[PDB]
Ligand binder design. Structure first.
Ligand code: SF4
Ligand SMILES: [Zn+2]
Ligand SMILES: [Zn+2]
Ligand SMILES: [Zn+2]
Lengths: 335, 698
């Protein structure tokens, strides 16, 4: 579904002490949490880490659905020192060579964490921006403080003529907010194209560990997933089986689709003097008054979050709890 | 916009009441404000009434006024669907608006008019007694060619492509279209021209609306209209020019003497009035503004011929070599110099009429006239016209003994600048006087006395997008007063000043333009800067404007500066605030987002031209040692202020050094004083708040 290509700046501009302790020690650290934010909500998606060091582009993490491959790839970058200059043309041309195995049915995304202010590209960088629109590659650049005129054209021409993707970060708290929105998908208006995907087999949970069985490694294992097509007991994963090119997901894709179909109905916060109901919660027991600023002009006023799907009173605490996980408002399941 | 309607309601109230209005406009936000109101005031009155007359200061503002008029016609043909009587004429230069010197001559200089008169008289020689015409003559004055402009807009670039496809001439189309009177776009060097404006004023035939565009260097054009230097090499041209007239009088009196004898009787009867009336489509002579000189009933060397007129001229040039052969510093009164001339040779009081008739005579007499010889005669004849009349405000100065080799340099000082601006008030009414680089505008009621109204810029909003700070302490507040002196005192401080520029450019490496009050400060640090980290890790390439800035060098430094910011590089534009190319094009991120100024702009003092104009304006307006160091220093700084304000959509930071800027005013006076190292953390915030407040105010 998704095949994100992480583009990290690893140059001498990241040696500055803007963040704590520096820019490179927080970019690598927050990206490990972004790997955890990506494979949980999207367990059947892809990731790819491309650094920009010494005026080139180095591939440290291959495109794979295993999250541990991107963790250990980022543990080796923090050991060395970011040197050189960023190369946006070599990073995008390397991102083009990996998204060509990615089909048109899977969405191709490129995220650029650009903390520098000057890059070193070989040829014309405008020939690389127009190539990402020809094969439809959604590029998003996260610039630090000042804005670059190159990233304005990159986050607009590759994004259906709309410049709203080149975001400017100003704090480490705001940098984690960018990793929460990038973990979520981008359900845009698209270009109205056809879509049809098949060949999705089911993994049989096998636990044979006497003399073991491994079709993707030929080693000892404590139980692997059996493919429903080639009948191979490879590694237990919700991705594709490496013997007949068939999937092996289960309820992991159903949980991602349930979150994708989650519209999250926010409860309408009506006052206790306006909704004509007592202070109560449909999820728990919020028997305390919300508003209590003034004497009796606010304490008797209060607020009761009335969800319009079942006319159930709630508070402000469980209205964000029902929209985060599970189903939006538990009164919707009862008629 | 509502702020653009505030100046438009003032333009709709002054064009139908006042005769001249000093309207102040903000920078980068007043171009199309008066453009649409000029076509709306004509549409509210009559569309064939008073046409629009535009007076730019550069050729770029002539080119920028043509594309905005296309947007006015596109807004009138899409929102209305009716194609009315079109107008608009691109009156540009002669070397640019040509076809013949771009094919065979391959020269883009000032000699394009010499091949023009050779083809005009060559077509006249092919249609009288007999080279011939050119590529496309005897067809551009047709009625179908006169209708190619009210039907289709073909001005400058659209007309140069039209004269190649239809095979026409760009000179005879535009010259025949001043009489049609359209929306005429031209610069300040044509309205106050003593060889062009005498021909322009006879074809517009008045009754129009003059639009003064960027009217802040009006006092500079009136000085540039005169003041010619005589650096002794013209005496070698006048010596060889006098011997050429001796051979020409020997050639005229050897065979065909009836052509000069009948011209002598035509000058003894029809004089200069019939001589100018008979002469058509030929090379015109020179005069000191015939619409301002006003002289009639002349005589040809007191009923004499060309043989007696060249004897007075050879008597004249040796006296000029006698007066130039002097000591050093010596001033001259133009009336007392004429009295010392009459003690040498009685040349009466009218040599103004003794030269303009003989200049037109030698064109009709000598057919193979030399270029350097006849131009040497026009340099004397222009000086002979200025010593005959116009002595009030005039002054003759001599350059001193400056090694002395380069010492014989003679110059005449211009008169009052109000005299050149005088005939534009009685010829045209409702003259819209607009400028975006003026703060304040009270010197224009003072200097150049004319009765007008004063309107300021009523547009100031969104101060969070227009960062206007200023630097005071440069770490020690020593290099601010160090750049104040004219001479480069203490170059170690300038090396410390140039060390701060590498620190200042490395903070924000996203488009940098650095102005200078003189090229001496640019040449002082370029010899041994010992600091190229910004020229190898920040701005990389260097765009430094030299003192002898070539037109191709200024063009190549401008395009590569646009190529630097369009590749994620950034460049340093080291220009001169007193130099050429005042710019004005921005409204994008390709321009320098942070503009640096080295101190305050200064003027070249201790010069005879400045000391003459100091005592001249001391008797006029009593503004001695005030406006000369402040009103002139503001307008050279206001050209740097017109580039940062590129509309309300684009941001920009303009820092100013020293402390003498607080005594003057500025466009949108919202300025906070801080140090140099303090503004490095302020501009890092201003380059991040403006990136977050852009989507918040929408
Ligand atoms: S007619 Fe026009 S193109 Fe031909 S020489 Fe004269 S100015 Fe040039
Ligand atoms: Zn399989
Ligand atoms: Zn509750
Ligand atoms: Zn509900």
């Amino acid at each position: 579904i998704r095949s994100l290509i992480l583009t990290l700046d690893c140059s001498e501009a990241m040696l500055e002490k803007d963040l704590r302790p520096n820019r490179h020690a927080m970019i690598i650290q927050y990206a490990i949490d972004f790997v955890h934010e990506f494979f949980d909500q999207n367990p059947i998606s892809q990731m790819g880490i491309i650094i920009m060091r010494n005026g080139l582009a180095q591939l440290v993490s291959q495109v794979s659905g295993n999250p541990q491959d991107h963790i250990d790839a980022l543990k080796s970058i923090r050991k060395q020192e970011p040197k050189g200059n960023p190369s946006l043309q070599n990073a995008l041309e390397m991102a083009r060579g990996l998204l060509l195995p990615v089909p048109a049915h899977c969405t191709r995304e490129v995220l650029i964490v650009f903390g520098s202010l000057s890059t070193t590209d070989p040829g014309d960088i405008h020939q690389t921006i127009d190539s990402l629109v020809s094969e439809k590659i959604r590029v998003k650049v996260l610039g630090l403080s000042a804005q670059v005129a190159i990233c304005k054209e990159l986050c607009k021409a590759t994004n259906y003529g709309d410049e709203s993707f080149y975001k400017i970060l100003l704090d480490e708290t705001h940098l984690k907010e960018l990793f929460n929105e990038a973990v979520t998908p981008x359900x845009x208006x698209x270009x109205x194209x056809x879509x049809x995907x098949x060949x999705x087999x089911x993994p049989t949970r096998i636990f044979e560990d006497t003399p073991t069985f491994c079709s993707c490694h030929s080693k000892l294992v404590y139980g692997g997933y059996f493919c429903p097509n080639c009948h191979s007991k490879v590694c237990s994963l919700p991705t594709v089986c490496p013997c007949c090119d068939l999937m092996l997901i289960l309820x992991x894709x159903x949980x991602x689709x349930x979150x994708x179909x989650x519209x999250x109905k926010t409860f309408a916060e009506v006052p206790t003097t306006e909704k004509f109901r007592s202070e109560d919660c449909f999820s728990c027991q919020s028997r305390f008054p919300x508003x209590x600023x003034x004497x009796x002009x606010x304490x008797x006023x209060x607020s009761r979050y009335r969800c319009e799907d079942c006319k159930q009173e709630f508070c402000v605490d469980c209205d964000v709890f029902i929209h985060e996980i599970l189903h939006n408002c538990p009164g919707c399941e009862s008629k | 916009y509502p702020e653009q309607y505030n100046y438009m309601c003032d333009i709709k109230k002054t064009l139908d009441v006042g005769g001249n209005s000093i309207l102040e406009m903000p920078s980068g936000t007043g171009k199309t404000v008066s453009l649409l109101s000029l076509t709306i005031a004509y549409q509210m009155h009559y569309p064939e009434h008073r046409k629009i007359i535009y007076c730019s200061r550069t050729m770029s503002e002539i080119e920028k006024a043509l594309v905005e008029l296309e947007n006015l016609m596109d807004y009138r043909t899409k929102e209305l669907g009716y194609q009315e009587d079109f107008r608009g004429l691109g009156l540009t230069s002669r070397k640019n608006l040509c076809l013949h010197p771009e094919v065979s001559k391959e020269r883009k200089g000032t000699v394009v008019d010499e091949k023009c008169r050779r083809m005009t008289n060559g077509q006249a020689k092919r249609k009288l007694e007999e080279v011939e015409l050119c590529e496309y003559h005897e067809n551009l004055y047709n009625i179908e060619v006169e209708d190619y402009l009210p039907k289709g807009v073909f001005s400058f670039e659209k007309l140069l492509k039209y004269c190649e496809e239809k095979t026409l001439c760009p000179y005879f189309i535009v010259r025949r279209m001043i009489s049609l009177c359209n929306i005429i776009i031209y610069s300040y060097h044509y309205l106050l021209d003593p060889k062009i404006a005498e021909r322009v004023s006879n074809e517009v035939s008045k009754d129009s609306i003059v639009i003064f565009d960027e009217a802040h260097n009006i006092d500079n054009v009136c000085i540039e209209s005169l003041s010619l230097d005589l650096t002794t090499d013209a005496l070698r041209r006048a010596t060889r020019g006098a011997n050429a007239l001796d051979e020409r009088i020997s050639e005229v009196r050897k065979v065909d003497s009836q052509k000069l004898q009948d011209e002598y009787e035509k000058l003894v009867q029809g004089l200069x009035x019939x001589x100018x009336x008979x002469x058509x489509x030929x090379x015109x002579x020179x005069x000191x503004x015939x619409x301002x000189x006003x002289x009639x009933x002349x005589x040809x060397x007191x009923x004499x011929r060309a043989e007696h007129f060249v004897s007075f001229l050879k008597r004249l040039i040796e006296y000029l070599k006698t007066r130039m052969k002097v000591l050093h510093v010596i001033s001259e009164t133009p009336k007392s110099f004429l009295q010392h001339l009459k003690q040498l040779t009685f040349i009466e009081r009218k040599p103004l009429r003794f030269c303009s008739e003989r200049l037109s005579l030698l064109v009709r007499t000598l057919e193979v006239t030399e270029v350097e010889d006849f131009t040497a005669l026009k340099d004397i004849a222009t000086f002979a016209t200025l010593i005959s009349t116009y002595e009030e405000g005039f002054l003759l100065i001599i350059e001193p003994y400056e090694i002395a080799v380069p010492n014989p340099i003679m110059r005449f000082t211009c008169l009052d600048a109000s005299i050149a601006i005088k005939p534009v008030f009685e010829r045209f009414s409702s003259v819209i006087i607009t400028s975006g680089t003026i703060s304040p505008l009270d010197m224009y009621p003072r200097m150049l006395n004319f009765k007008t109204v004063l309107q300021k810029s009523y547009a100031m909003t969104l101060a969070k997008k227009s960062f206007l700070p200023m630097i005071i302490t440069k770490g020690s507040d020593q290099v601010a007063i160090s750049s104040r002196f004219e001479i480069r005192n203490d170059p170690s401080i300038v090396r410390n000043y140039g060390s701060m520029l590498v620190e200042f450019a490395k903070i924000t490496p996203d488009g940098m333009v650095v102005f200078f009050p003189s090229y001496l400060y640019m040449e002082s640090i370029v010899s041994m800067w010992q600091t190229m980290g910004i020229l190898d890790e920040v701005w990389k390439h260097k765009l430094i404007l030299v003192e002898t800035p070539d037109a191709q060098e200024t063009s190549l430094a401008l395009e590569t500066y646009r190529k630097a910011c369009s590749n994620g590089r950034g460049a340093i534009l080291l220009s001169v605030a007193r130099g050429k190319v005042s710019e004005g094009i921005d409204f994008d991120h390709q321009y320098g987002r942070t503009v640096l100024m080295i101190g305050i702009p200064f003027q070249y003092t201790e010069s005879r031209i400045l000391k003459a104009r100091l005592e001249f304006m001391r008797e006029n307006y009593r503004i001695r040692e005030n406006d000369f160091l402040s009103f002139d220093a503001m307008r050279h700084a206001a050209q740097c202020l017109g580039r940062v304000l590129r509309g309300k959509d684009d941001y920009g930071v303009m820092v100013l050094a020293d402390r003498r800027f607080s005594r003057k005013r500025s466009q949108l006076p919202k300025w906070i004083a801080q140090g140099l190292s303090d503004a490095d953390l302020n501009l890092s915030t201003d380059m991040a708040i403006s990136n977050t407040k852009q989507f918040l105010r929408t």
